């Protein structure tokens, strides 16, 4: 059966994370005209705020919104870890890294 | 300069921490059963007729 060798290089400080993102509406068809800027919070003191960060994926309709701390912030986040691996087909090595999953949802104010 | 979607992932993987079954021994009881009641040994008559 097909294997891995596994490596986690992960982050150096723990620092860096990738980001995942899914939409509570279902695919994007055309996830390829959508901007996503990561936001996150200017408070890097505070230990509870430093690691809040907002997620916004703008389309030309609509905008998404996703973040990982309050109602939003779904159980996945932290009773699940998340890692994105990157398999080198040709050695058979995959590389492992800390994820973070952001839920998408759309933007509209009274 | 901004994020944007990258390639479908091509398989996931979900983890999980899980240890192994034993032998099967089945060791039912310390004392096992009901054990009977049974004869006091000898025990003897304890009463006798008049005469």
């Given amino acids: ?110 | 300069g901004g994020l944007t979607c990258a390639s479908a992932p091509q398989g996931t993987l979900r983890i999980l921490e899980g240890p192994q079954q034993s032998l099967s021994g089945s060791p039912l009881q310390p004392i096992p059963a009901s054990p009977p009641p049974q004869i006091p040994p000898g025990l003897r008559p304890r009463f006798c007729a008049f005469g």
Avoid at chain 1, 83 to 96: A, D, Y
Wanted: aromatic letters at 10%; charged letters at 20%.
């Fill in chain 1, 1 to 110: 059966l097909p294997s891995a060798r596994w490596q986690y290089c992960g982050a150096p400080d723990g620092s860096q994370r990738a980001v995942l993102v899914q939409f509570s509406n279902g695919k994007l068809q055309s996830p390829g005209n959508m901007r996503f800027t990561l936001y996150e919070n200017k408070d890097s003191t505070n230990p509870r705020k430093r690691n809040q960060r907002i997620l916004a994926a703008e389309t030309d309709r609509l905008s998404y919104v996703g973040n990982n701390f309050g109602t939003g912030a779904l159980k996945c986040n932290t009773l699940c870890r998340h890692f994105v691996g990157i398999l080198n087909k040709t050695s058979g090595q995959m590389e492992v890294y800390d994820a973070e999953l952001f839920n998408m949802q759309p933007l509209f104010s009274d």
